Amino acid sequence: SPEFMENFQKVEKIGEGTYGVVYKARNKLTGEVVALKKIRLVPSTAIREISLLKELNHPNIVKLLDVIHTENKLYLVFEFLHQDLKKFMDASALTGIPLPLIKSYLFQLLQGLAFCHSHRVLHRDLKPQNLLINTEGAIKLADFGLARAFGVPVRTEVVTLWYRAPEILLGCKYYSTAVDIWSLGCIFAEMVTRRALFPGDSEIDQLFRIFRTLGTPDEVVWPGVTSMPDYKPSFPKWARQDFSKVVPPLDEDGRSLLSQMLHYDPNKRISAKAALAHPFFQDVTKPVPH
């Protein structure tokens, strides 16, 4: 103490992220491998949200070990992890992730989200590449979306659209913790089917792909939807599709949970805390990935 960037030896780039390149590095003093994020350099609400995220200590949130300030630079020192759910799904495309691991990962992500949400922290940008996994079966939240959400002046892609809740796409100013449950519901479906649920290429295309699968919402399904800032009565009217077609492998317990996570109305969408008690998790275990 203090640590300096000279105390770290770069090993390899371990991928990109909302802040560009992440590096595997080695502490020359201790031998510990870590993951380093470089942030090139803030609104008052943004400082406060960063402080809230720094407060969080949880098994399912990637552990921040240190923050090193040098001139224009911030170097975030994290625990070393180097697999993520997107890379794991791609390597498992031939066979699919086994259901006990799907259940375990979904359960843990709900635990991490429940913890964030009770501390007034939202993720806002949940996607499979932001979800880090280790050898012992844990999965962890990372690359929180607060820089673009709170106008942080830091350098920071259609993949982000695929997991965006419909109340965001329709312009809602004061969205809620429910946006994270939507994203996780999409990831749940994607683990099961081995394909992204709503891979749109623009905000309107994302909306139309959602509508084509879940039905065009109306006031009966989603009170207030037709007055949302970007709602247009010219939207096409699609009927809802059966989950036997949308997520063929799921049974009624899985379809029940997924339908509650993808509820149009954010006020009716299941909370993270409540989803942990869903019957789907009756037999949840902690398997190790291969």
Catalytic residues: 125
What is the rounded CA–CA span in Å between residue 216 and residue 70?
51
**Which C-beta is closer to ligand N5R: that of 145 or that of 217?**
145
In the complex, the smallest distance separating the C-beta of residue 152 from ligand N5R, rounded to whole angstroms, is 4
**Crossing angle of helices 99-118/178-193, nearest 10°?**
170
For residue 27, what are the β-bridge partners?
8
Asked if 62 touches ligand N5R (CB under 6 A), the answer is: yes
Number of Cβ atoms within 10 Å of the Cβ of 9: 11
Residue 232 is assigned to a ligand binding site: no
**Which C-beta is closer to ligand N5R: that of 142 or that of 161?**
142
Residue 254's Cβ-side half-sphere holds a number of Cα atoms within 13 Å equal to: 22
Q: By the 8 A CB rule, do 89 and 194 touch?
A: yes
**Which C-beta is closer to ligand N5R: that of 20 or that of 171?**
20
**Which C-beta is closer to ligand N5R: that of 64 or that of 168?**
64
Residues 98-157, interacting with ligand N5R (CB under 6 A): 142-144, 146-147, 152, 154
Query: Residue 63: which residues within 8 A CB-CB, separation 6 or more?
Result: 57, 78, 79
Residue 81 is assigned to a ligand binding site: yes
Binder to ligand N5R among 48, 54, 232, 286 (CB under 6 A)? 54
In the complex, the smallest distance separating the C-beta of residue 105 from ligand N5R, rounded to whole angstroms, is 18
Asked if 53 touches ligand N5R (CB under 6 A), the answer is: yes
Which contiguous run of DSSP H or E holds residue 251? none
Cα distances (Å, whole numbers) of residue 264 to 19, 60, 116, 131: 31, 27, 22, 24
What is the rounded CA–CA span in Å between residue 183 and residue 169?
13
Residue 22 is assigned to a ligand binding site: yes
**Which C-beta is closer to ligand N5R: that of 84 or that of 143?**
143
Asked if 170 touches ligand N5R (CB under 6 A), the answer is: no
């962890």: which residue's tokens? 140
As given in the structure block, the two tokens for residue 107 are 């359960």
Asked if 39 touches ligand N5R (CB under 6 A), the answer is: yes
The runs of H, that is alpha helices, within the chain are 44-55, 85-91, 99-118, 146-149, 166-169, 178-193, 203-214, 243-246, 252-261, 272-275
Asked if 76 touches ligand N5R (CB under 6 A), the answer is: yes
The piece of 49-57, 89-97, 245-253, 275-283 that touches ligand N5R (CB under 6 A) is 49-57
In the complex, the smallest distance separating the C-beta of residue 56 from ligand N5R, rounded to whole angstroms, is 7
Q: Characterize the bridge pairing of strands 22-27 and 139-141.
A: unpaired
The piece of 4-12, 46-54, 112-120, 183-191 that touches ligand N5R (CB under 6 A) is 46-54
Binder to ligand N5R among 21, 29, 42, 204 (CB under 6 A)? 42
Give the number of residues in contact with ligand N5R, rule: CB under 6 A. Answer: 20
Binder to ligand N5R among 21, 29, 67, 93 (CB under 6 A)? 67
Residues that bind ligand N5R (CB under 6 A): 19, 37, 39, 42, 50, 53-54, 61-62, 64, 67, 74, 76, 142-144, 146-147, 152, 154
